[PDB]
Design a protein around this nucleic acid. Structure first.
Ligand SMILES: [Cl-]
Ligand SMILES: [Cl-]
Lengths: 114, 114
DNA sequence: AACAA
DNA sequence: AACAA
């Protein structure tokens, strides 16, 4: 089963302009009912560049706690609906506390917090 | 200026699987601070198929009220970060009341309503 | 297992 | 100015 908070490897290419491209981890952010029934999921891109602009839609995840290659950043300004066929290996899954930070960053990203 | 609630024509192709494809209207759902400063926006796809599965992430918009070709549906389960270069003509913009419905549907889509 | 408030 | 809870 695909669950919200799961992290999968996925290929985001091809892309245009400053849409996040390439093969990378992505975190599932769609609700679990959609994750059960739909052929598609919604994800946010993850990157290993810790020197990006300091944007309020960024959430850090630590290499130690998760089975990561390096300290990474979830980009809640870089969100895609992907067909499940794009999802390859499940790499890890985020903690409840970390997902609360993701939820907050999504509220900001999408202007839902008024 | 690109504003949240604006509707633009955009080309979503190429896509994979059941990711929404093709040239179609899209609604800006990213916050207005990002819309000012970022080269990218976040959008939801719009479709003219009023016979889709009845999903709680769907929000109807009426042909009369907006300058539309036909009664349409906003698919809050089909959301993309797009480079602004993808945005062509501004077709219309949604009312405050309609955007409240969009906000609610996004909360559902992304499981933010617990 | 990129670049760009 | 598609298909698929
Ligand atoms: Cl390009
Ligand atoms: Cl395909």
């Amino acid at each position: 089963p695909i669950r919200r908070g799961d992290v999968y490897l996925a290929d985001l290419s091809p892309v245009q302009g400053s849409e996040q491209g390439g093969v990378r981890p992505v975190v599932i952010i769609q609700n679990d009912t959609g994750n059960k029934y739909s052929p598609t999921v919604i994800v946010a891109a993850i990157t290993g560049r810790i020197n990006k602009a300091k944007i309020p839609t960024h959430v850090e995840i630590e290499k130690k706690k998760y089975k990561l290659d390096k300290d990474s950043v979830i980009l809640l300004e870089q969100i895609r609906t992907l067909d499940k066929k794009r999802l390859k290996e499940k790499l890890t899954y985020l903690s409840d506390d970390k997902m609360k930070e993701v939820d907050n960053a999504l509220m900001i990203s999408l202007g839902l917090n008024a």
